Design a protein around this ligand. Structure first.
Ligand code: ZN
Ligand code: ZN
Ligand code: ZN
Ligand code: ZN
Lengths: 360, 360, 362, 362
């Protein structure tokens, strides 16, 4: 597997696992990274939905940032500064739960620019992202204000860029050649939207969560990498959750997007590479799902789990697995009252030795 | 290692690892599990500050619920209804940033009763727990309201218990013979507490975060298990973060408790078992931080890391590691317009085959 | 998942993962753990072929103990005294490589009984398991002998039970209502076999390695669990190894059972549950190997990986993943080879130890 | 931590982890991977003792290669044909046990060259390395002869270079500016030796296993990277294994090198970077072992675990963790034993295979 090693001291070229930080990115390359691939419940194996896009121009975007995902992203050896721009498909906890870890993380890590979040609005004001993020920052006021004694604020504020969720394929973004176009989803209630990044002959479709809609097959068409929701079987639902045979069925026909329906949809889209996510990829579950997609779609497919990579070049769409550090490191008025400051225990004696050495 | 097997087919007694869900709790026993141990930065090896505490009476608490920790908490195979009661040592994102995941996740899981959150105030309204939770709830108002349509809204409530943070070893919880006292800590700004849980002759202190203070050594005294802040050395702060000498020195005095500071307090508390946490537990870090302590403290110590489980009985406080599933499962007006509902693609065909087959 | 938790302080019943040590085995129960599911080449994620079998009568068996398999076998919290019977499907390193780890290992851990090894004959004396095991024990004579000074030599023996590789589903082991049958495979050269375990009306079959043969479909028939080679797709053979098209083809027809061949074999046998192993279980191999079998076989299947476990009861063959300590420990259940030339090289370490030596002696 | 990123599309320099295959080794640089730090029992967390060296010249050695070390070694993305030369400290299974996965593996991992194995003699022929390997090849006879049939058997040769164990720092290897010297060790029985690697004024000592001996401290002097046995405290011997204090107390004074002896030795040696191994590095064990070193040694210290790497440059000795593939694949470098009683067993699967064969061949 991977390229042929030439010299004993020489670097293995075209490695068959992706080491984040180790590889140059082509001007005519994209590098996508599943930093989140599972849904409702948490699990070391699968963070909540989160993707890292890396364009050869230098522009990098996080599309969804759910609970768990921050751990994987931080393993990518990418400084805080470069990951400022965030794109949410809906306001489910497991799509932007970990914005605050980023928000707070990056600020302590030395991020200089404020996070820019694009999201869908709601049917009313309190159902949108402008509201959601506005209340987040209020929620974490005790964090914000304390930190904003010792660190310049600006990297604390969040420039939100809300749009109309109802809008069919309209332009939500356009800088440095990169375009994002959002369109609606039929999931839980009004607001949820699917994205389509377009840049340098390349098209990448983020499906977020949706029961099958007529806006995906249309605006997806002829994409390098197309990601869409693709769910457990109605059998597996009964097994795991103890569901009965009417709820189990409907969940795959009404509320969510089946495998067998995920297939038909991509068959319509004809992407360079289709990507099925948002299911617990386990030894007892993953297979039956793959046999669904196959019924009605026979093109290049990735059954997504955490830290799966796509290198979109001209010639090919190559899937690999990232192998990244678990012991990950970041890479490069007073909120005290005199009632708290007058408590400081004397440790001047306990610490005199190490200090002395440290100061000589 | 562990108990002596007494039959081929029988269970291994006093096993050398803790297998979550596999062991009965005794009546005069306490299980504390570290589900978070690792400062603000994200990494799979170490979730943010989170502890699960099981008492023999049948009560169970969570003390801090920082980003990531829900992946460790959920692996303990505990029905979400038993984990309703949550004590917050403060409102850093790395202490309560995964309550949201608990809130939403646990409600899909099947929590029937609301979440109960014990936290401090600030030195004004918009710096305390009552304010952060109500603004966290409004933050996720789309998630709340969409789910409410299809699941009774009762569990989606959070009952907030603001305590006064100023208070100096004063009761904040007294139910079923279990008594939580708080006291202030010196960290970021006014607000952060430590917790003393008392029950059936046991005492378990949760430090949280604190520069050395005159209250912890007094109020934690003789604790069966004593958890305190322990930072990484002022060389280590230069090595990893590129920090200057002047700053790195300061950090292990003003901002955080040194391993040496940590040693003094533990000398002055003389607990049955000490625990250092909050430092990154690595090959290249752990040994100088462990030594830092040994300058002053000599008795029993754990160097904390995710899924360390303490067993507190009359005779011993025994250290082990929990071995738990990464592929974890849970254990037992509309917000749609007719503009979105119209959008449904037709997949009666593609789903026909499996649909007919499942129904018999 | 699993069973409903009925008390706060009590035990989770029927847990969805298998914690080894943690479950009692009922008398009509069979537990099978995959301790090695991997190809010829080493990898942490997958040990070479190994299987641990637990029958509810108290009897246990390892079928194959290939390279890297002991790390998984040790993780099951079974005392060495309980794992002394080892069956080999052939003498590929990838199938008995770690025999010498269990032998030397267990003898430290404190095993009292010799190891017992059933293995095929060859066409001739020096292609069989008696010859193999004789010359392993010669290969590791410095360990056998040095260890024998300090530890009783009895358990450092290995009684070999060589059977006839040519024999068509004949008994190789009959003991305490347990039967092992062997039949031939078509693999590397003459030697290799499959096994059928017959106990309490249960039939577990360990296929080993073999190009599709006429013996497996016949004898395995109606197995409770039937374990069979399931190779990686010729396409993947090109991609991964840069194999020229026409060679890759030959491998999936001639030298190893392809997924469709496995799919055909398992329709004929009609097992309660069918296991594919041998192949590298990756995010970019497993699925088309599943596709392959599903073309030809429709009933209950597992796609093997390390620490996969089957419990066989009258009512079910349930598949879980085991969750097992990486930081594993052993669970408890003649003249000197020194000359004074080497003994006169010791260092005086009375000073530096004094402090821990004083304290520890109180 | 590590070097600064100064480009968005760029390679991040001086990374705080080591990504095997990803780093260019310099002329004035040695790279030392622990491919195995473990004890006599199996655990996934720690293979039995093994080491890989890669020298700035291009030369690459394995020092010891114990059971379950081949996973970690395969994870390094080094072609098999670059890991030809093997040195054994002793004939403990936990030190050479995975020479047979190297031999069978490497062959199918692209080794065209035969194995060179340097090991020590014992008190007699049957206790040397010549004999061990002789009989190892004889163990896997079935493996050899089937494998070789239609192939060149060259890389199937293990050339053993056996030296005297009682020879005091006498050269056992001199090739392309690399020197290996050996002295004895006190351990089990006359035979175990400890190597020193010399090259470009670099000294890298490979202890092996030994109770404190007078030799190591002399010949390991001014080491760049001095590796040595370090045992668990006599406490951790009573806790886990249930030893009486007497035996527990003695284990650490008589048989094995105590944390305090380890430190007494490295103070005598004065190495640029010492390396304790050969203990189960666990959350309840590692701390009482560091301390017992620190008693009598204050130099740069590594507490060894599987996949730790040391970069030996002119300016420093930098310790790191290797981040590597669990899904390991080999990387490409630059009379038949069948009777017709077995080849007459081949099943018809021409139907089943028809669909995929047609697709693949077009
Ligand atoms: Zn959703
Ligand atoms: Zn804090
Ligand atoms: Zn074979
Ligand atoms: Zn040894």
């Amino acid at each position: 597997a991977g390229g042929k090693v030439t010299s004993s001291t020489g670097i293995a070229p075209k490695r068959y696992v992706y080491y984040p930080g180790s590889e140059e990115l082509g001007p005519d390359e994209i590098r996508v990274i599943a930093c989140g691939t599972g849904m409702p419940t948490a699990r070391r194996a699968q963070a909540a939905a989160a993707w890292v896009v890396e364009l050869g121009n230098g522009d990098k975007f996080i599309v969804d940032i759910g609970s768990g995902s921050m751990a994987n992203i931080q393993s990518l050896m990418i400084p805080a500064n470069y990951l400022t721009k965030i794109f949410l498909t809906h306001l489910h906890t497991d799509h932007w739960g970990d914005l605050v870890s980023m928000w707070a993380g990056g600020w302590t890590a030395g991020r200089t620019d404020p996070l820019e979040v694009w999201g869908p609005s709601g049917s009313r004001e309190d159902m949108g992202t402008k509201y959601a993020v506005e209340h987040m920052l209020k929620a974490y006021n005790w964090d914000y204000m304390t930190r904003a004694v010792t660190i310049n604020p600006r990297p604390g504020d969040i420039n939100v860029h809300e749009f109309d969720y109802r809008a069919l394929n309209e332009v939500v973004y356009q800088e440095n050649g990169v375009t994002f176009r959002s369109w609606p989803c039929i999931h839980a209630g009004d607001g949820p939207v699917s994205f389509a990044l377009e840049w340098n002959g390349y098209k990448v479709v983020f499906g977020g969560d949706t029961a099958p809609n007529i806006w995906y097959p249309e605006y997806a068409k002829g994409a390098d990498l197309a990601i869409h929701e693709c769910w457990m079987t109605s059998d597996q639902m009964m097994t795991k959750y103890n569901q009965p045979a009417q709820l189990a069925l409907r969940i795959n026909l009404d509320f969510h997007t089946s495998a067998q329906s995920f297939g038909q949809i991509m068959n319509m889209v004809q992407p360079r590479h289709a990507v099925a996510y948002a299911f617990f990829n386990d030894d007892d579950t993953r297979y039956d799902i793959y046999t669904g997609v196959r019924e009605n779609y026979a093109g290049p497919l990735s059954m997504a789990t955490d830290m799966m990579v796509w290198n979109i070049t001209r010639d090919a769409v190559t899937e690999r697995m990232a192998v990244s550090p678990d012991h990950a490191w970041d890479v490069a008025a007073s909120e005290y009252t005199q009632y708290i400051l007058d408590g400081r225990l004397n440790v001047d004696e306990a610490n005199a030795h190490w200090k002395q050495e440290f100061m000589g």
